[PDB]
Amino acid sequence: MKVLILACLVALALARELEELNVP
Amino acid sequence: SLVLDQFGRNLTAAAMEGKLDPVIGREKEIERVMQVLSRRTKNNPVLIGEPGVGKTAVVEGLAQAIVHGEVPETLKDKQLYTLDLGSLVAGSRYRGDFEERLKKVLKEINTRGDIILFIDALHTLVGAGAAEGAIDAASILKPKLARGELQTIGATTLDEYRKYIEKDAALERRFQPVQVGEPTVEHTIEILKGLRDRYEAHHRVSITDAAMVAAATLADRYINDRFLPDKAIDLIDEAGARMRIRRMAEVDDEQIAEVLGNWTGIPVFKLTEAETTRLLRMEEELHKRIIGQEDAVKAVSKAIRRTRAGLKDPKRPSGSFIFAGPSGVGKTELSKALANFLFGDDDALIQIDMGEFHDRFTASRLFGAPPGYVGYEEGGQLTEKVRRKPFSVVLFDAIEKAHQEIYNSLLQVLEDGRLTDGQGRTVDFKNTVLIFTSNLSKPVGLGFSKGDYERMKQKVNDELKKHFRPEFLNRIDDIIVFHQLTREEIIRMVDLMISRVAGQLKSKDMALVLTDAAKALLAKRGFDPVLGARPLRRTIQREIEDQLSEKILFEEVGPGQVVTVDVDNW
Amino acid sequence: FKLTEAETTRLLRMEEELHKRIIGQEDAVKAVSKAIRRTRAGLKDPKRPSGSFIFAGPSGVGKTELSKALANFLFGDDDALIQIDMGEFHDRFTASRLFGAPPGYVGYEEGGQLTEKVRRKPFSVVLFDAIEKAHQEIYNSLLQVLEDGRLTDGQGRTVDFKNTVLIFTSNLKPVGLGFSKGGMKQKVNDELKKHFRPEFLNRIDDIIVFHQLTREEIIRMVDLMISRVAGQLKSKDMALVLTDAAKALLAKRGFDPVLGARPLRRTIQREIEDQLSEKILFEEVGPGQVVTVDVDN
Amino acid sequence: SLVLDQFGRNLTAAAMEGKLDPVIGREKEIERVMQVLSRRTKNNPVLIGEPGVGKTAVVEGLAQAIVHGEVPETLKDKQLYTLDLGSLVAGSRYRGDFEERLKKVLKEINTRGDIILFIDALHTLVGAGAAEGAIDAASILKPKLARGELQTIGATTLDEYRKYIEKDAALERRFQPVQVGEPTVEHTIEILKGLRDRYEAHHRVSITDAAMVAAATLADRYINDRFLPDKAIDLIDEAGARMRIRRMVAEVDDEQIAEVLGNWTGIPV
Amino acid sequence: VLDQFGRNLTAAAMEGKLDPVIGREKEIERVMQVLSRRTKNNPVLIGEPGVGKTAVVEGLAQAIVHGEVPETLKDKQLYTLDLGSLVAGSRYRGDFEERLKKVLKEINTRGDIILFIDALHTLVGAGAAEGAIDAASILKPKLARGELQTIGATTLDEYRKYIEKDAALERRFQPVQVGEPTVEHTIEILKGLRDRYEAHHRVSITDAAMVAAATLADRYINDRFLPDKAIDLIDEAGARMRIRRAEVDDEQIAEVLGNWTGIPV
Ligand SMILES: Nc1ncnc2c1ncn2[C@@H]1O[C@H](COP(=O)(O)OP(=O)(O)OP(=O)(O)O)[C@@H](O)[C@H]1O
Ligand SMILES: Nc1ncnc2c1ncn2[C@@H]1O[C@H](COP(=O)(O)OP(=O)(O)OP(=O)(O)O)[C@@H](O)[C@H]1O
Ligand SMILES: Nc1ncnc2c1ncn2[C@@H]1O[C@H](COP(=O)(O)OP(=O)(O)OP(=O)(O)O)[C@@H](O)[C@H]1O
Ligand SMILES: Nc1ncnc2c1ncn2[C@@H]1O[C@H](COP(=O)(O)OP(=O)(O)OP(=O)(O)O)[C@@H](O)[C@H]1O
Ligand SMILES: Nc1ncnc2c1ncn2[C@@H]1O[C@H](COP(=O)(O)OP(=O)(O)O)[C@@H](O)[C@H]1O
Ligand SMILES: [Mg+2]
Ligand SMILES: [Mg+2]
Incomplete structure (x- = not known):
């Protein structure tokens, strides 16, 4: 009864793209 | 020269080649962009606006204004480039292979010197x-x-300006918000008139001057999630492509309006003679499955005939009704019958169980939860059923069991035709038919008096004034007190209820026919003025439905034609 | 900016241009027209909002219609009216629609449905329709809005409500309890003192209790509502002409002091434009023909 | 061509090979798709619909409408590709690999010009x-x-159209919502009668006409977690898949589907 | 599908490395009934954790070898698949998706794969x-x-929270309810498994041990289900006998139950 649910959204755990180090 | 060609579209060369659609109007903003571009230190106009209002058309209107000579002598002959950031990221693998390629761009703009970048998005x-x-x-x-040594026009959706530009406000400083507002109805007509050549040529079909007046007015009031200088072009092209689909003539008001009827669901097209007879025969078609209740059948037929004739208020719903009366007389049967006239099925009726809103806090089912609460991913159980179906009959079944604070969420529903959900999206209820059935017995008063429909209409009208606020009954179009079902109306409801029982027997490959002695006996045992048509519904269940349900299982009545005959009467 | 010669005359005509839509309600118009004259004369208080009004009064006499006539005056359409329908806010926690979610909760990125309407348009008429039907601490979130002129977003941005005109249309049947001569405004004023928290009433610039629409104003209201159905909804090459006995019959049927102008609007869709919609579908009188309306009885 | 084949499946080539089941009905829905696809700008339809009503089946009806030539001439000889977005994200560890793979798709579409890029989900x-x-x-x-320089059909659940396309209000403008509705029961019987030969051939059973009439009326009346043009096929399959099971021909009848539905919801039908 | 992210349960069943499955013969038929469908042939095994949902599929993988197939499940290899093992090792973009598109490429090329994904x-x-x-x-x-046959496994709560809350995922996985077995069914499970436990621990498990393991586990343990809490008792008692060294009875499984639960004697 009128106890509110508090969604509490997480920060985005997401992928990462890459700069790569060039080699021969 | 060709460094910008492989990462951006030369939008000035697109205007010389006529690849840009003619931008008619929004030239008070093309001059506003050129006032920002001719500045000294920060000369970078971001075109913010609602998605579809022609933000990227202003720059296409600017790139046309470069080559027309409409441009002043401070931006004269400047090659504009729509820089594709996705093309700058593409072709990178390693470290620096993005940042080198962007410095190749700015080295060319320093060199060539007449470059106006356009970062679309x-x-x-x-x-x-x-x-x-x-x-x-x-x-x-x-x-x-x-x-100020780099001129860069931006364009961002207003929702995406607060989320990505304003989130890192150092970039927001470098740009000037040039507010690109939505066109008016009168302004997007002449937008469509300039765009008429490009869509008459692609679709090989003429477009009437009326059809673009139609596609501006019909896109304004009957679309409430898009924006004008795009949602009007949607009606032109889809009617333009409807004409070149069937011919594989011209585009009328009717050709635009039947596209919107297939896009929303709202019947805004001019009625054919076969259909408009059914609109005049609406009472007699509603009386096919409601019996009696003639002042209510007229009242909801007046609301739809006013809607199809186009005489309803454009800022209000099609009809707002309270169906008050004794229980069982067809408050909900009629709201299903009205939803079968308009659609064909009664599950297209948006039945809101309004008796289960007895708590003072279930109003969040109607508009969703506010931000910070789960139930934010869901816009609501009422807003999202009309965001999908704008032309609806929204039945609020048995309203007098809910709290007073559920009614207050429905005030602007009735007057303004709006209901903004918790996630910030107003939903038009301007095309719905809002039915509020109220169940508000003993065939005497309390005390000494001289006295159905007499001393009950004035009784329940004062019980609506007592239960509701006078601002809610103010907004309701018609309040129809319902009659108690008379004896001659229960006789015709036997014919309706048996024909579903016989309809249950058509699947069993038989049919049920009743005699006039036996339909009278069901009507004599099914009549009750204070509970009407459910004691008839129970009598057929107790004396026809289950006794035939036994005789099917005896194999006594198989698929042969059973006729139910009276036991004895008179 | 210093006003155009046309805009100077229009703004002195501001009462008589807002009376093109608002029939009657004369002190309601010349309380909200003076607030725009203060802003445009360079006499706006640079801390306080431009106008702060409680349009209290009886239901249907033009509370929302004046907020729309004001928004059409200042912008050209009443769709530029920021209308926050306060009946949606029934409990304490829908105040997170005024300023958005706090950090760490869903809807934090969208940052409010009132604050972001004013970051785009800081000059705005902000309508709070049916503010009585909000919770008792929805409007306690607007106690810095109406003196300090700003509301801190959940994301952390104070937004200027200074150049806005805030309007709180509160909604305040026949005679009250007991013996009284005649038959009111002080009943409406003191009900605001019992409902609203007098921190909120001191921040309101003007509390305007609206009038009953008189019968001489309902006759003028008939001409306004017939002007809706003709010309905007009878662009079918059809013209709607009403005889002066027909507008008198609509006024005698649509006039009840206690509601005002919605019983007139329900009368027109019961006498005029539902009988007319039966005549268009039957094509008794159809597209390409002038409709006259003679008096029925 | 070869770039589109490794990032997606040609549905037109799949309709030449007969790998797409017949789409009986949906004539007015595919006509609405071809109407949207024939636009000059924003020629991008989205089949919004309840989950399972045949959103991806309408496009399968379009892929075999191109092979039959029942499309208009502006959509004749179009190659309809289901764009596998997972194939584009696959092998995109480094920056700019995904954006390279997507611009290589679009460079092939601008080159050929006969590509309708169906993006399911x-x-x-x-x-x-x-x-x-x-x-x-x-x-x-x-x-x-x-x-309108990229013809693209979308297919999105109405629940998944709120959360990800109406939360990106710019992208919602670029598309046209083609409402693929839940069909009526009489339409579903014609769907089931048109799919009679596909499930006769895989379950090796003859399925009678009353069994198709039952499994549309029995599913609509007695199953509510799914939608019509799917929960009716669902009763046809587990009818015939039980006959492949217990026989390790026998006709599928009203009794053969009611015993599936009795073992389905627990409702004795 | 590679043996990197799972293993071939039919090649294990051909070599006889899987557990003998006594009981659950009706549930395997319901899995075969869902797998024999032309479309949507995806049986999710809804059951409490450790009721034998893999033991349904281990018995199903034997039934490929034993020839109890409906001729549409004939010579179908059944590679199990840890869905979380594809997740493991993904911090950068296209790490999960590449390893998922590879294992779906190896189903279209091979053409007889029935994935068993748990979780x-x-x-x-x-x-x-x-x-x-x-x-x-x-x-x-x-x-x-129907171009991909995946056998699922949820609990009932995971099915409610993640699949029944997901639009367009209820219709693609068809529920097969693997129930919680009774006490006599659990003994018959233990009667079939005893040729493995008496040959692994090199002990002899008496018949009195299993009638006690199906009764004492229900009587004293409530956080975990039967066709596992009863298998465990005659497993650790064989290991405790191998450690103390041979015959397991209702006294040898006795002190094994007393090790965990807070029983001093
Ligand atoms: N002033 C205008 N004159 C002519 N056409 C216009 C005008 N404004 C927009 N359009 C038309 O709008 C269509 C494309 O939409 P528009 O350019 O408005 O998108 P936008 O405002 O950039 O929106 P978004 O930010 O979502 O891309 C084109 O057909 C274009 O010609
Ligand atoms: N006027 C009517 N016409 C046709 N059927 C009616 C009518 N009145 C009642 N019925 C029948 O009675 C049954 C239930 O009545 P209905 O659904 O209309 O409820 P209602 O009038 O809203 O009353 P309440 O909500 O108090 O039960 C249905 O079988 C319906 O067909
Ligand atoms: N002063 C007025 N001038 C013109 N029309 C009026 C006026 N008052 C009422 N009307 C007519 O009746 C309608 C009701 O007016 P309005 O929307 O302002 O109601 P309100 O006073 O806000 O009532 P409520 O208490 O229900 O909110 C108007 O839209 C108009 O059609
Ligand atoms: N009109 C139709 N004619 C023939 N088969 C149809 C029709 N509509 C649906 N089906 C069949 O019913 C099933 C519907 O699944 P389909 O994926 O096509 O629909 P959907 O609603 O897009 O589902 P999802 O959202 O899961 O992709 C398929 O087996 C499809 O072949
Ligand atoms: N007929 C059977 N039913 C259930 N479990 C069995 C059966 N035969 C053997 N087992 C045992 O089941 C276990 C396999 O795990 P399982 O019970 O399938 O886990 P989950 O039920 O959580 O999927 C092993 O201990 C195996 O020996
Ligand atoms: Mg744009
Ligand atoms: Mg009002």
Whole structure:
């Protein structure tokens, strides 16, 4: 009864793209 | 020269080749952009606006104004480039292979000197080579943009300006918000008149001057999630492509309006003679499955005939009704019958169980939860059923069991035709038919008096004034007190209820026929003025439905034609 | 900016241009027209909002219609009216629609449905329709809005409500309890003192209790509502002409002091434009023909 | 051509090979798709619909309408590709690999010009190839979709159209919502009668006409977690799949589907 | 499908390395009934954790070798698949999706694969989100056309929270309810498994041990289910006998139950 649910959204755990180090 | 060609579209060369659609109107903003571009230190107009209002058309209108000579002598003969940030990221693998290629761009703009970049979708600029706290396409441009040695027009959706540009407010400084507002109805007519040549040529079909007056007015009031200088073009092209589909003539008011009837669901087209007879025969078609209740059948037929004739208020619903009366007389049967006239099925009726809103806090089922609460991913159980179906009959079944604070969420529903959900999206109820059935017995008063429909209409009208606020009954169009079902009306409801029982027997490959002695006996045992048509419904269940349900299982009545005959009467 | 010669005359005509839509309600118009004259004469208080009004009064006499006539005056359409329908806010926690979610909760990125309407348009008429039907601490979130002129977003941005005109249309049947001569405004004023928290009433610039629409104003209201159905909804090459006995019959049927102008609007869709919609579908009188309306009885 | 084959499946070539089941009905829905696809700008339909009503089946009806030539001439000889967005994210560890793979798709579409790029699960486009510093596949396609230089059909659940396409209000403009509705029961019987030969051939059973009439009326009356043009096929399959099971021909009848539905909801039908 | 992310349960069943499955013969028929469908042939095994849902499939993988197939499940290899093992090792973009498109490429080329994925609560949100590319967006076009036969396993709560809350995932996995077995069914499980436990521990498990292990486990243990809490008692008692060294009875499984639960004697 009128106890509110508090969604509490997480920060985005997401992928990462890459700069790569060039080699021969 | 060709460095910008492989990462951007030369939009000035697109205007010389006539590849840009003619931007008619929004030239008070093309001059506003040129006032920002001719500045000294920060000359970078971001075109913010609602999605579809012609933000990227202003720059296409600017790139046409370069080659027309409409441009002043401070931006005269400047090659504009729509820089594709996705093409700058593409072709990178290694470290620096984005940041080198963006410095190749700015080395050319320093060299060539008449370049106006257009970052369409300027929110893409933050986080384009790495994260926001690293070297990306934003952090490279920020020393160039604040000096004024780089002119860069941006364009961002207003919702995406607060989420990505204003989130890192250092980039927001370098740009000037040039507010691109939505066109008016009168302004988007002449937008469509200039665009008529490009869509008459692609679809090989003429477009009437009336059809673009139609596609501006019909897109304004009957679309409430898009924006005008795009949702009007949607009605033109889909009717333009409807005409070149069937011919594989011209585009009328009716050709635009039957596209919108297939896009929303709202019947805004001019009625054919076969259909408009059914609109005049609406009472007699509603009386096919409701019996009696003639002042209510007239009242909801007046609301739809006013809607189809186009005489309803454009800022209000099609009809707002309270169906008050004794229980069982067809408050909900009629709301299903009205939903079968308009659609064909009674599950297209949006039945809101309004008796289960007895708590004072279930109003969040109608408009969703506010931000910070789960139930935010869901816009609501009422808003999202009309965001999908704008032309509806929204039945609020048995309203007098809910709390007074559920009614207050439905005030602006009735007067303004709006209901903004918790996630910030107003939903038009301007095309719904809002039915509020109220169940508000003993065939005497309390005390000494001289006295159905007499001393009950004035009774329940004062019980609505007592239960509701006078602001809610103010907004309801018609309040129809319902009659108690008379004896001659129960006899015709036998014919309705048996014909479903016989309809249950058509699947068993038989049919049920009743005699006039036996339909009278069901009506004599099914009549009750204070509970009407459910004691008839129970009598057929107790004396016809289950006794035939036994005789099917005896194999006594198989698929032969059973006739139910009276036991004895008179 | 210093006003155009046309805009100077229009703004002195501001009462008589807002009376093109608002029939009657004369002190309601010349309380909200003076607030725009203060803003445009360079006499706006640079801390306080431009106008702060409680349009209290009886239901249907033009509370929302004046907020729309004001928004059409200042912008050209009443769709530029920021209308926050306060009946949606029934409990304490829908105040997170005024300023958005706090950090760490869903809907934090969208940052409010009132604050972001004013970051785009800081000059705005902000309508709070049916503010009585909000919770007792929805409007306690607007106690810095109406003196300090700003509301801190959940994301952390104070937004200027200074150049806005805030309007709180509160909704305040026949005679009250007991013996009284005649038959009111002080009943409406003191009900605001019992409902609203007098921190909120001191921040309101003007509390305007609206009038009953008189019969001489309902006759003028008939001409306004017939002007809706003709010309905007009878662009079918059809013209709607009403005889002066027909507008008198609509006024005698649509006039009840206690509601005002919605019983007139329900009368027109019961006498005029539902009988007319039966005549268009039957094509008794159809597209390409002038409709006259003679008096029925 | 070869670029599109490794990032998606040609549905037109799949309709030549007869790998797409017959789409009986949906004539007015495919006509609405071909109407939207024949536009000059924003020629991008989205089959929004309840989950299982045949959203991806309408496009399968379009892929075999191109092979039959029942399309208009503006959509004749179109190659309809189901764009596998997972194939584009696959092998995109480094920055700019996804954005290269998506611009290589679009360079082939501008070259050929006869490509209708069906993107099933269009809600997955918002965030497709979105990394820390990347460009999502929405923002690459938004200039293409707005100018009508990329014909693209979407197919999105109505629940998944709120959460990911109406939360990206720019991308919602670029598309046209073609409401694929839940069909009526009489339409579903014609769906089931048209799919009679596909499930006769795989379950090796003859399925009678009353069994098709039952499994549309029995599913609509007694199953509510699914939608009509699917929960009716569902009763046809587990009818015939039980006859492949217990026999290790026998006709599928009203009794053969009611005993499936009795073992389905627990409702004795 | 490689042996990197799972193993071939039919090649294990051909070599006889899987557990003998006594009981659950009716549930295997319901899995074969869902797998014999032309479309949507995806049986999710809804049952409490450790009721024998893999033991349904281990018996199903034997039934491929034993020839109890409906001729549409004939010579179908059944590679199990840890869906979380594809997730493990993904911090960069296209790490999960490449290893998921590889294992779906090795089904179209090979052509007889029946995936057994456990943990379908992990399916929703296997990538970043649903608007992102997850395994509950890659599998779904092939789970509606019958071109991909995946056998699932949820609990009942994971099925309610992750699949019944997911639109367009209820219709692609068809529920097969693997129930909680009774006490006599559990003894018959133990009678079939005893040729493995008496040959692994090199002990002799008496008949009195199993009638006690199916009774004492229900009587004293409530956080975990029967066809596992009863298998465990005659497993550790064989290991405790191997450690103390041979015959397991209702006294040898006795002190094994007393080790865990807070019983001093
Ligand atoms: N002033 C205008 N004159 C002519 N056409 C216009 C005008 N404004 C928009 N359009 C038309 O709008 C269509 C494309 O939409 P528009 O350019 O408005 O998108 P937008 O405002 O850039 O929206 P978004 O930010 O979503 O891309 C084109 O057909 C274009 O010609
Ligand atoms: N006027 C009517 N016409 C046709 N059927 C009616 C009518 N009145 C009642 N019925 C029948 O009575 C049954 C239930 O009545 P209905 O659904 O109309 O409820 P209602 O009038 O809203 O009353 P309440 O909500 O108090 O039960 C249905 O079988 C319906 O067909
Ligand atoms: N002063 C007025 N001038 C013109 N029309 C009026 C006026 N008052 C009422 N009307 C007519 O009746 C309608 C009701 O007016 P309005 O929307 O302002 O109601 P309100 O006073 O806000 O009532 P409520 O208490 O229900 O909110 C108007 O839209 C108009 O059609
Ligand atoms: N009109 C139709 N004609 C023939 N088969 C149809 C029709 N509509 C649906 N089906 C069949 O019913 C099933 C519907 O699944 P389908 O994926 O096509 O629909 P959907 O609603 O897009 O589902 P999802 O959202 O899961 O992709 C398929 O087996 C399809 O072949
Ligand atoms: N007929 C059977 N039913 C259930 N479990 C069995 C059966 N035969 C053997 N087992 C045992 O089941 C276990 C396999 O795990 P399982 O019970 O399938 O886990 P889950 O039920 O959580 O999927 C092993 O201990 C195996 O020996
Ligand atoms: Mg744009
Ligand atoms: Mg009002």
